[PDB]
Ligand binder design. Structure first.
Ligand SMILES: CO[C@H]1O[C@H](COS(=O)(=O)O)[C@@H](O[C@@H]2O[C@@H](C(=O)O)[C@@H](O[C@H]3O[C@H](COS(=O)(=O)O)[C@@H](O[C@@H]4O[C@H](C(=O)O)[C@@H](O[C@H]5O[C@H](COS(=O)(=O)O)[C@@H](O)[C@H](O)[C@H]5NS(=O)(=O)O)[C@H](O)[C@H]4O)[C@H](OS(=O)(=O)O)[C@H]3NS(=O)(=O)O)[C@H](O)[C@H]2OS(=O)(=O)O)[C@H](O)[C@H]1NS(=O)(=O)O
Ligand SMILES: O=c1ccn([C@@H]2O[C@H](COP(=O)(O)OP(=O)(O)O)[C@@H](O)[C@H]2O)c(=O)[nH]1
Ligand SMILES: CC(=O)N[C@H]1[C@@H](OC[C@@H](O)CO)O[C@H](CO)[C@@H](O)[C@@H]1O
Length: 493
């Protein structure tokens, strides 16, 4: 009866909390006999390989389907032919016939016509990927992109060598979508779906049509929008019965802002709460802040579902401080390096294991070296097994300035690893009980945080006691039953 469609930009293998919560939410709805699938809107040439990898890793439940806008029309297109598009491949081969090949490296080569003496093509082969750039009067006109020698995309270039047009090709090499690209901002213009002879004014129009085709207009159909920038796709559909929910995963205020500004995407979701079935926030404090600040009522608090597995059989007695996150500015890993410097200057035995990848990773690497912490702080890369990494840590640290909730802190507490976190909006004070299951540090206070890490790393009994109470607190306050009943209460009203 009930079926759920959870919307986000894309799915990939080295992501953070938002997709992690969608994957766990899907598992919980399927266990309660409610199919809950993921709808994505990006274009990938190898989506089938991403899905298999996420499922093999155990991140994505085997029952979770991913519905993708390009995949839907590509699959319709695949059914149209039996034979591969031999003529497109013959056309490409003919344009390279009667040329001079000039090799630059392995995989890289250039082609010059024997008669016109001019530069025809550039080919770059790396692994399973191939790119063929064609030229006219020493200017790049087009690029054909291949995966396992099969064309998947053609891009056209303007005078400034910027993308002005794209064509997507199915599994047999036939075009199924063609679209204009505004080279000034990279936005998608008029899109033509060759397979059904339908044209759309832009990508949002295509995505709105797609959702109306995918999701039947029944009260049993439930749309949950997780990706904030994706909210207009769900919001603009013509559904009269299907339910619409927006989940806000972050602090709705603008990050690194003293003017009090609100994030644009989240502001649009909140302001439109009364026009949909509900806008979900992860903590009670955010719901109250929103209600005080905005003229809306449809704000509901529903925590992320929590996966309570078995606690690691042994406590880490070694001075290992862990940190598992997306390496992004809001996590303030620079403050963690500054804290590490203080902890290491009072105790040189304490190790800091930092997992993840992101924009700040290089800045942080240079920062450890400049502070000469290369013997104590280790950038361990992304982990597909955070639960196993958690066993190696004595405690976990959070210098993050903004959260919606904080699954890594919650995950550490489930593995009996106490958290030392800056008391920020939102999340830490909901689950950390200061001096009972961890420590809540006054925001920016790097000295008091360094002091609490030192007390904790050098006290085996306190570290074990805090961790034990931490798992107990999560089990008690984040039951799957109460969270599922909160969602069911909305779906049934
Ligand atoms: C006239 O042009 C002007 O308006 C149009 C829209 O109006 S129109 O309909 O009249 O044409 C604007 O075009 C639209 O918006 C563009 C844009 O916002 O850039 C663009 O949207 C697409 O691309 C965005 C960027 O993609 S990215 O892959 O390069 O980042 C994308 O938004 C991004 O979403 C990701 C995400 O959710 O994955 C965000 O990343 C964040 O979350 C990740 C996942 O979380 S997790 O925890 O790991 O699981 C994290 O990994 C990541 O660290 C984190 N980044 S962080 O900074 O928050 O820490 C990322 O920040 C976003 O940028 C869009 O996805 S969406 O869900 O937001 O919709 C995506 N839309 S899609 O292609 O349809 O999927 C498009 O060109 C267009 O989108 S639209 O929906 O088709 O309308 C146009 O820009 C504007 N030009 S302007 O006026 O000059 O500014
Ligand atoms: O190397 C890494 C880094 C992050 N994560 C996961 O990404 C999520 C991060 O969640 P959180 O809410 O703490 O922060 P967010 O990424 O949403 O900003 C957690 O479930 C982590 O286990 C992971 O699996 N491996
Ligand atoms: C930094 C931040 O606010 N992250 C939140 C969010 O992640 C997604 C964020 O990338 C979207 O831009 O979602 C997680 C799961 O709900 C929260 O636990 C987490 O706090």
């Amino acid at each position: 009866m009930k079926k759920i469609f959870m919307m986000v930009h894309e799915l990939d293998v080295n992501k953070g909390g938002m997709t992690s919560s969608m994957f766990n939410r899907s598992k919980e709805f399927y266990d309660a006999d409610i199919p809950a699938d993921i709808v994505t809107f990006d274009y990938k040439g190898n989506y089938d390989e991403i899905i298999k990898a996420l499922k093999k890793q155990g991140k994505m439940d085997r029952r979770t389907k991913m519905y993708n806008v390009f995949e839907y029309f590509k699959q319709i297109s695949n059914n149209k032919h039996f034979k591969s598009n031999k003529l497109l491949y013959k056309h490409i081969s003919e344009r390279l016939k009667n040329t001079i090949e000039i090799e630059e490296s392995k995989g890289i080569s250039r082609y010059f016509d024997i008669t016109t003496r001019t530069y025809i093509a550039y080919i770059r082969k790396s692994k399973s990927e191939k790119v063929i750039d064609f030229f006219k009067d020493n200017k790049r006109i087009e690029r054909f992109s291949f995966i396992d020698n099969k064309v998947h995309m053609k891009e056209t270039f303007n005078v400034d060598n910027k993308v002005c047009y794209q064509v997507f090709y199915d599994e047999k090499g036939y075009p199924y979508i063609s679209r204009n690209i505004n080279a000034n901002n990279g936005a998608v213009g008029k899109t033509y779906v060759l397979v059904n002879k339908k044209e759309f004014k832009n990508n949002l129009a295509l995505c709105v049509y797609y959702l109306e085709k995918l999701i039947k207009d029944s009260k049993d159909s439930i749309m949950i929008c997780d990706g904030p920038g994706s909210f207009p796709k769900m919001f603009n559909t013509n559904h009269k019965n299907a339910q619409k929910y927006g989940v806000i995963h972050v602090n709705h205020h603008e990050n690194f802002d003293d003017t009090g500004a609100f994030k644009k995407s989240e502001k649009y979701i909140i302001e439109n709460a009364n026009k949909i079935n509900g806008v979900i926030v992860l903590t009670e404090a955010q719901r109250l802040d929103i209600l005080n600040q905005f003229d809306v009522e449809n704000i509901f608090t529903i925590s992320n579902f929590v996966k309570i597995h078995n606690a690691p059989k042994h406590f880490q007695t070694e001075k290992i401080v862990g940190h598992i996150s997306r390496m992004v500015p809001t996590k303030r890993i620079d403050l963690l390096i500054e804290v590490a410097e203080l902890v290491v200057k009072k105790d040189n035995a304490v190790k800091f294991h930092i997992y993840g990848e992101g924009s700040v990773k290089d800045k942080i690497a240079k920062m450890i070296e400049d502070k000469n912490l290369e013997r104590n702080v280790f950038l361990k890369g992304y982990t597909t097994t955070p639960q196993k990494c958690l066993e190696d840590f004595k405690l976990v640290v959070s210098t993050s300035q903004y959260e919606g909730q904080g699954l890594s802190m919650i995950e550490a507490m489930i593995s009996k690893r106490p958290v030392v976190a800056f008391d920020i909006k939102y999340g830490p004070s909901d689950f950390i009980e200061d001096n009972k299951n961890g420590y809540l540090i006054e925001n920016h206070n790097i000295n008091d945080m360094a002091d609490k890490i030192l007390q904790l790393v050098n006290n085996d009994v306190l570290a074990a006691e805090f961790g034990s109470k931490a798992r107990e607190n999560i089990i008690e306050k984040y039951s799957t039953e109460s969270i599922l009943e909160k969602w069911l209460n909305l779906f049934n009203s």
